[PDB]
Homo-oligomer: A and B are copies of this chain.
Amino acid sequence: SKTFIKYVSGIPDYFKQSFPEGFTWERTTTYEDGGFLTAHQDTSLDGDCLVYKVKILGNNFPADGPVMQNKAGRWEPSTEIVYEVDGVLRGQSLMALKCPGGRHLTCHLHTTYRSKKPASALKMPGFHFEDHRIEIMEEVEKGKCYKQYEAAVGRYCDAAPSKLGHN
């Protein structure tokens, strides 16, 4: 849901620029214990309402792992590196599930974001970071119903500045 990002430091917003046409994204998440989760998404704008259509194929999750056992606690916050490749945007991030007991199960996200606008009508952002805070606020049902919050920020590595003037 990349339309909802606070970009700081003048980093161009690839996603907000893509409208009214919108954008797509494609992703494979590789889990450290062998699971793969692949997804494709279309984002469109229907008047005032964003519309997402998602297709998912997941496989190779171990029967005894936290995912198939439904013993995943919560996501840690994560930071994505986002940069231009092949006239589109690539993203990679490391995410970590904080399982009950304290162990983390990690995964590596490989994403390509594709504008429905041609690259020539877009201001591409430079290499930067995108912080994602994803929290399940309530397990309403099972299994069946979840309330999920996200806060996202597009920024540079401000905490450890360059002494050459690089972002």
Task: Count the copies.
Answer: 4
Chain B residues with Cβ below 8 Å from A39 are: 57
A143-167 interface code vs B (CB 8 A; 1 in, 0 out): 0000001011101110111111011
CB <8 Å contact, B62 and A86: yes
User: How many residues from A make CB contacts under 8 Å with B?
Assistant: 65
Question: For the complex, is A139 an interface residue (Cβ under 8 Å from B)?
Answer: no
Q: A interface, by DSSP: helix, strand, loop or mixed?
A: strand
Chain B residues with Cβ below 8 Å from A32 are: 34
CB <8 Å contact, B157 and A135: no
CB <8 Å contact, B86 and A64: yes
> What is the bound-complex CA distance between A155 and B149, given in angstroms?
22
